[PDB]
Amino acid sequence: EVETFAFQAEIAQLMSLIINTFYSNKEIFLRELISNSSDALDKIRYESLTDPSKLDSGKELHINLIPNKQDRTLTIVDTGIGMTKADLINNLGTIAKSGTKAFMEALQAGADISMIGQFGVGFYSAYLVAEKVTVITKHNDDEQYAWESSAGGSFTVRTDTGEPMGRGTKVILHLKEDQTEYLEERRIKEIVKKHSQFIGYPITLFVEK
């Protein structure tokens, strides 16, 4: 059973801008998603200091990068705090409204797309390289859910029936046909070394066989 929602008007305009603007420095999408993963790992690690039982769903705090050339997908996995159903539908888009609005004003004040993380909406930079983004997430306080959008103004949320994650978030990027360079190992390594050398959690690049 699937539910379809409309994006916030501001969010929908940001995604249409991100998709339709000719912007060449697309590699910043990885820094933003890794930075989001780092924040999610910070939150569960902090909460576990006063409640060690929050880690019963998994003690490992790490980020995995998993390219897949046959499926043309790049997947970013973290074992952070994860997201509830309310996060996916209401709360996170509500926090992001002021940031989205401010980000689009700045885009005419001279600022460029690479400053998206300074407004707390770096996640949507995934649509620089992805035609479709699937998010699998599991919070200690909710069930496992699957969020998905190909932009166009709508997204879906459903209960996920697949392999249980335990805890964390899996961002699955269905890459555009001309963006397969981000499925290459030395390209991913160069981007991580350039943008995310100072992340306080292990970032493991899964090499294909």
Ligand X SMILES: S=C(NCCc1ccccn1)N[C@@H]1C[C@@H]2CC[C@H]1C2
Least CB distance from residue 124 to ligand X, whole Å?
7
Edge-to-edge strands of the sheet including 144-149? 2-6, 154-159, 144-149, 130-138, 168-175, 73-78, 63-68, 203-205
| Rg of the chain taking only CA atoms, in angstroms | 17
Does 80 engage in binding with ligand X (CB under 6 A)? no
Q: Give CA separation, 2 vs 89, 146, 162, 173, in Å.
A: 13, 10, 15, 20
Does 201 engage in binding with ligand X (CB under 6 A)? no
Contact window for ligand X (CB under 6 A) among 1-9, 13-21, 119-127, 158-166: 119-127
Site for ligand X, residues 19 to 58, rule: CB under 6 A: 36, 39
CA distance 115 to 120: 10
Site size for ligand X, by CB under 6 A? 12
Contact window for ligand X (CB under 6 A) among 13-21, 42-50, 52-60, 116-124: 116-124
Q: Which residue is nearest to ligand X (CB)?
A: 92
Specify whether the CB–CB gap between 57 and 150 falls below 8 A. no
CA-nearest of 75, 91, 27 to 204 is: 75
36 is in an annotated binding site: yes
| CB closer to ligand X out of 36 and 196 | 36
Contact window for ligand X (CB under 6 A) among 12-20, 49-57, 92-100, 176-184: 92-100
Going by the annotation, the residues of the binding site for ATP are 36, 78, 97, 123
